[PDB]
Design an enzyme around this catalytic site. Structure first.
Site, PDB file in Angstrom:
ATOM      1  N   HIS A  61       0.906  -1.361   0.063  1.00 32.41           N
ATOM      2  CA  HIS A  61      -0.055  -0.116   0.009  1.00 32.41           C
ATOM      3  C   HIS A  61       1.023   1.499   0.083  1.00 32.41           C
ATOM      4  O   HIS A  61       0.323   2.337  -0.353  1.00 32.41           O
ATOM      5  CB  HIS A  61      -0.927   0.023   1.343  1.00 32.41           C
ATOM      6  CG  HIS A  61      -1.663  -1.354   1.431  1.00 32.41           C
ATOM      7  ND1 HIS A  61      -2.680  -1.428   0.580  1.00 32.41           N
ATOM      8  CD2 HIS A  61      -1.817  -2.140   2.564  1.00 32.41           C
ATOM      9  CE1 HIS A  61      -3.390  -2.734   0.956  1.00 32.41           C
ATOM     10  NE2 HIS A  61      -2.632  -3.034   2.181  1.00 32.41           N
ATOM     11  N   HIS A  91       5.655   6.985   6.652  1.00 30.54           N
ATOM     12  CA  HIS A  91       5.357   6.475   5.228  1.00 30.54           C
ATOM     13  C   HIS A  91       4.890   7.878   4.464  1.00 30.54           C
ATOM     14  O   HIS A  91       4.505   8.819   5.131  1.00 30.54           O
ATOM     15  CB  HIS A  91       4.204   5.512   5.106  1.00 30.54           C
ATOM     16  CG  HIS A  91       2.979   5.704   5.737  1.00 30.54           C
ATOM     17  ND1 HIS A  91       2.758   5.595   7.194  1.00 30.54           N
ATOM     18  CD2 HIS A  91       1.981   6.190   5.307  1.00 30.54           C
ATOM     19  CE1 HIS A  91       1.517   6.337   7.563  1.00 30.54           C
ATOM     20  NE2 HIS A  91       0.845   6.607   6.208  1.00 30.54           N
ATOM     21  N   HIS A  93       1.912   9.217   1.204  1.00 31.40           N
ATOM     22  CA  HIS A  93       0.934   8.760   0.331  1.00 31.40           C
ATOM     23  C   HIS A  93       0.968   9.914  -1.014  1.00 31.40           C
ATOM     24  O   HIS A  93       1.459  10.807  -0.553  1.00 31.40           O
ATOM     25  CB  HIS A  93      -0.472   9.229   0.754  1.00 31.40           C
ATOM     26  CG  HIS A  93      -0.801   8.538   1.931  1.00 31.40           C
ATOM     27  ND1 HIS A  93      -1.704   7.215   1.899  1.00 31.40           N
ATOM     28  CD2 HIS A  93      -0.482   8.808   3.462  1.00 31.40           C
ATOM     29  CE1 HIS A  93      -1.898   6.864   3.248  1.00 31.40           C
ATOM     30  NE2 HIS A  93      -1.134   7.729   4.018  1.00 31.40           N
ATOM     31  N   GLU A 103      -3.625  13.523   1.285  1.00 30.93           N
ATOM     32  CA  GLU A 103      -4.829  12.937   1.863  1.00 30.93           C
ATOM     33  C   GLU A 103      -5.541  14.132   2.437  1.00 30.93           C
ATOM     34  O   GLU A 103      -6.814  14.413   2.073  1.00 30.93           O
ATOM     35  CB  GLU A 103      -4.409  12.064   2.943  1.00 30.93           C
ATOM     36  CG  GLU A 103      -3.791  10.870   2.279  1.00 30.93           C
ATOM     37  CD  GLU A 103      -4.145   9.419   3.011  1.00 30.93           C
ATOM     38  OE1 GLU A 103      -3.805   9.420   4.192  1.00 30.93           O
ATOM     39  OE2 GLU A 103      -4.531   8.843   2.398  1.00 30.93           O
ATOM     40  N   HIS A 116       3.465  11.078   6.597  1.00 29.58           N
ATOM     41  CA  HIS A 116       2.831  10.754   7.759  1.00 29.58           C
ATOM     42  C   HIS A 116       3.787  10.147   8.824  1.00 29.58           C
ATOM     43  O   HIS A 116       4.583   8.982   8.599  1.00 29.58           O
ATOM     44  CB  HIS A 116       1.888   9.742   7.818  1.00 29.58           C
ATOM     45  CG  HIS A 116       0.555  10.431   7.043  1.00 29.58           C
ATOM     46  ND1 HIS A 116      -0.552   9.521   6.464  1.00 29.58           N
ATOM     47  CD2 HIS A 116       0.239  11.587   6.839  1.00 29.58           C
ATOM     48  CE1 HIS A 116      -1.375  10.340   6.096  1.00 29.58           C
ATOM     49  NE2 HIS A 116      -0.979  11.828   6.319  1.00 29.58           N
ATOM     50  N   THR A 195      -6.003   6.522   8.025  1.00 28.63           N
ATOM     51  CA  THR A 195      -6.594   6.835   6.832  1.00 28.63           C
ATOM     52  C   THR A 195      -6.622   5.647   5.782  1.00 28.63           C
ATOM     53  O   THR A 195      -6.824   5.677   4.790  1.00 28.63           O
ATOM     54  CB  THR A 195      -5.856   7.917   6.159  1.00 28.63           C
ATOM     55  OG1 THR A 195      -4.494   7.474   5.773  1.00 28.63           O
ATOM     56  CG2 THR A 195      -5.925   9.287   6.798  1.00 28.63           C
ATOM     57  N   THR A 196      -6.117   4.524   6.768  1.00 25.51           N
ATOM     58  CA  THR A 196      -6.133   3.143   5.813  1.00 25.51           C
ATOM     59  C   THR A 196      -7.101   2.260   6.673  1.00 25.51           C
ATOM     60  O   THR A 196      -6.952   2.559   7.926  1.00 25.51           O
ATOM     61  CB  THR A 196      -4.967   2.354   5.427  1.00 25.51           C
ATOM     62  OG1 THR A 196      -4.277   2.293   6.741  1.00 25.51           O
ATOM     63  CG2 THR A 196      -4.050   3.275   4.580  1.00 25.51           C
TER      64      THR A 196
HETATM   65  O1  LIG Z   1      -3.292   7.182   8.859  1.00 27.70           O
HETATM   66  B1  LIG Z   1      -2.068   6.590   8.282  1.00 27.70           B
HETATM   67  O2  LIG Z   1      -0.984   7.301   8.829  1.00 27.70           O
HETATM   68  O3  LIG Z   1      -2.341   6.849   6.768  1.00 27.70           O
HETATM   69  C1  LIG Z   1      -2.290   4.971   8.607  1.00 27.70           C
HETATM   70  C2  LIG Z   1      -1.387   4.408   9.504  1.00 27.70           C
HETATM   71  C3  LIG Z   1      -1.467   2.919   9.841  1.00 27.70           C
HETATM   72  C4  LIG Z   1      -0.566   2.260  10.649  1.00 27.70           C
HETATM   73  C5  LIG Z   1      -0.506   0.881  11.325  1.00 27.70           C
HETATM   74  C6  LIG Z   1      -1.608   0.338  10.843  1.00 27.70           C
HETATM   75  C7  LIG Z   1      -2.477   0.766   9.742  1.00 27.70           C
HETATM   76  C8  LIG Z   1      -2.429   2.051   9.797  1.00 27.70           C
HETATM   77 ZN   LIG Z   2      -0.664   7.671   6.118  1.00 33.68          ZN
END
Ligand SMILES: [O][B]([O])([O])/[C]=[C]/C1=[C][C]=[C][C]=[C]1
Ligand SMILES: [Zn+2]
Length: 257
Positions: A61, A91, A93, A103, A116, A195-196
Site C-alpha cells: 500500500h 510513510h 501517500h 490526503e 505521515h 486513513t487506511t
Molecule cells: O493514517 B495513516 O498514517 O495513513 C495509517 C497508519 C497505519 C499504521 C498501522 C496500521 C494501519 C495504519
Molecule cells: Zn498515512
C-alpha cells in the site's frame, strides 16, 4: 483485499470496515478561514536526535520506514498532546500527477504527496493497545510540493529500487527523520482516524502548515514502486490516498495567527 483500485478502493472500504462512515474519519479538508487560532495550545516538541531507524518495507500500500520504539528515543510531545508519543514509522501517500496525492487538503488544494510520521502514546504500552484508544496515536502530517529537491529525502529515494514489490524490505539504519521537516512547526490539529483500514478513530492529527519541497525526480521514483508482488503483473504504486471525509462535529484548531 482492500486497496486503491476501482474494485477495492476507498468507496468500498465501508463494507469490511463500517467505521469508514464514522464520526471522526480522516483525512479532511482544512478550511483555513474557519480554523480557529487557539492561543492555549502548548509548544510542540519534536525530539528526534536519538532516533533509531531500522528497515524500509514495501507493504503493498505504501512503504514504511520503521524505527525502534522499545524505548523513548524519537518522541513527539507538546502541542495538543498530553504525554509522550513514540515514533514507530513514517510513510507517504502520493499521486500519479503532481496535482494530486495528499490526503488532507488546504482550502481544497491537493499537494503532490503527504508524509505521515506515526507516533503512539506510551501510556498504553504497545502500538496495538494504543490504536484502541481515542488518544492512542499522534500523526504528524507534512505536505510535499514539487519544486527544489529535499536533500534529507534522497537516502529514501535511493533505496526504493531494492523494495520495488510488495513484501520486500531492506536495511535502513542511521536515517535522520529531522531532514524531512520544514522550517516552521506551525500546525493545525483535529481528532481523527487512520486513513487506511482498519480506519480506527484513535488519532490526534497535527498537520504542518508549511510544505516541504521535493524534486520532480524524487516523486517520479515513488511512482516506480509496485503494489504487486514479485512475479506478478505490474501495477504502479500511485494514487494511494484516501479523499477528504466529512468534518462532522469537529473543530480544526490553528497554532498560529
Ligand atoms: O493514517 B495513516 O498514517 O495513513 C495509517 C497508519 C497505519 C499504521 C498501522 C496500521 C494501519 C495504519
Ligand atoms: Zn498515512
Amino acid at each position: 483485499h482492500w486497496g486503491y483500485g476501482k474494485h477495492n478502493g476507498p468507496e468500498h472500504w465501508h463494507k469490511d470496515f463500517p467505521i469508514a462512515k464514522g464520526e471522526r474519519q480522516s483525512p479532511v479538508d482544512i478550511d483555513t478561514h474557519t480554523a480557529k487560532y487557539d492561543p492555549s495550545l502548548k509548544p510542540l516538541s519534536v525530539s528526534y536526535d536519538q532516533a533509531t531507524s531500522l528497515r524500509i518495507l514495501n507493504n503493498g500500500h505504501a512503504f514504511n520506514v520503521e524505527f525502534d520504539d522499545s524505548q523513548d528515543k524519537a518522541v513527539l510531545k507538546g502541542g495538543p498532546l498530553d504525554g509522550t508519543y513514540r515514533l514507530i514509522q513514517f510513510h507517504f501517500h502520493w499521486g500519479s500527477l503532481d496535482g494530486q496525492g495528499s490526503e488532507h487538503t488546504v482550502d481544497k488544494k491537493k499537494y503532490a504527496a503527504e508524509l505521515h510520521l506515526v507516533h503512539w502514546n506510551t501510556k498504553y504500552g504497545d502500538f496495538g493497545k494504543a490504536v484502541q484508544q481515542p488518544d492512542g496515536l499522534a500523526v504528524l502530517g507534512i505536505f510535499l510540493k514539487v519544486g527544489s529537491a529535499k536533500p534529507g529525502l534522497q537516502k529514501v529515494v535511493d533505496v526504493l529500487d531494492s523494495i520495488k514489490t510488495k513484501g520486500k524490505s531492506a536495511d535502513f539504519t542511521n536515517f535522520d527523520p529531522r531532514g524531512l521537516l520544514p522550517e516552521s512547526l506551525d500546525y493545525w490539529t483535529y481528532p481523527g482516524s487512520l486513513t487506511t483500514p482498519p480506519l480506527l478513530e484513535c488519532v490526534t492529527w497535527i498537520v504542518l502548515k508549511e510544505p516541504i519541497s521535493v524534486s520532480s525526480e524524487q516523486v517520479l521514483k515513488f511512482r516506480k514502486l509496485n503494489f504487486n508482488g514479485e512475479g506478478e503483473p505490474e501495477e504502479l504504486m500511485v494514487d494511494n490516498w484516501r479523499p477528504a471525509q466529512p468534518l462532522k462535529n469537529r473543530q480544526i484548531k490553528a497554532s498560529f495567527k
